[PDB]
Ligand binder design. Structure first.
Ligand SMILES: Nc1nc2c(ncn2[C@@H]2O[C@H](COP(=O)(O)OP(=O)(O)O)[C@@H](O)[C@H]2O)c(=O)[nH]1
Ligand SMILES: [Mg+2]
Length: 178
């Protein structure tokens, strides 16, 4: 056994699924009834490529705007997260969110998460994004937006479906052990 202890702060706009990522990964079941603003005070255990890490998993909001700065220190990994149904949200990833880390977090890893993977091959999205014609975010459009900013790694995922969720945390593990 070991005891590697690593902070992870999840940053981003509203409606990416921050807290549905933070919860679901904990409990392994989507909050279908009610979800808070923020869900904090959580540790994941991840036994990955040999090493066992205690990956502490924090969060942020905006509703608590003046709390983003209080949560940045000691970060061993940032989860900057966007939502594929709000490509307007990848538009903030370069203005704000990256402009904030390199103030409250000089260096520090970033792993780009692209949530709401489900609202991509949907009707009501292709019917609404496409009503402002905004074709839901494609993979290589993100993947390479993550290269620009610095993301040692790229991820997308769903928390309704739960496919990816562990890798969005496991890839971070390695990211805090790199
Ligand atoms: N379709 C879909 N909706 C999601 C998913 N994850 C979260 N949501 C929606 O996002 C809502 C709230 O987003 P939340 O997790 O609070 O975002 P935050 O403000 O960024 O922390 C949930 O109540 C769901 O309606 C997902 O994987 N797929
Ligand atoms: Mg929430």
């Amino acid at each position: 056994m070991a005891a590697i202890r690593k902070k992870l702060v999840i940053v981003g706009d509203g409606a990416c699924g921050k807290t549905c990522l933070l919860i679901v990964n904990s409990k392994d079941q989507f909050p279908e009834v009610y979800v808070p603003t923020v869900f904090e005070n959580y540790v994941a255990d991840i036994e990955v490529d040999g090493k066992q890490v205690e990956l502490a998993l924090w969060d942020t909001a905006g509703d608590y705007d003046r709390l983003r700065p209080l949560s940045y220190p000691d970060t061993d990994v940032i989860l900057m997260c966007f939502s594929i149904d709000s490509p307007d949200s990848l538009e903030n990833i370069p203005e704000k969110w990256t402009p904030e880390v390199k103030h409250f977090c000089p260096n520090v890893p970033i792993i780009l998460v692209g949530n709401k993977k489900d609202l991509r091959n949907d009707e009501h999205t292709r019917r609404e994004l496409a009503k402002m014609k905004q074709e839901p975010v494609k993979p290589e459009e993100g993947r390479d937006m993550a290269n620009r900013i610095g993301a040692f790694g790229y991820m997308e995922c769903s928390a309704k479906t739960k496919d990816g969720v562990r890798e969005v945390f496991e890839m971070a593990t390695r990211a805090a052990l790199q």
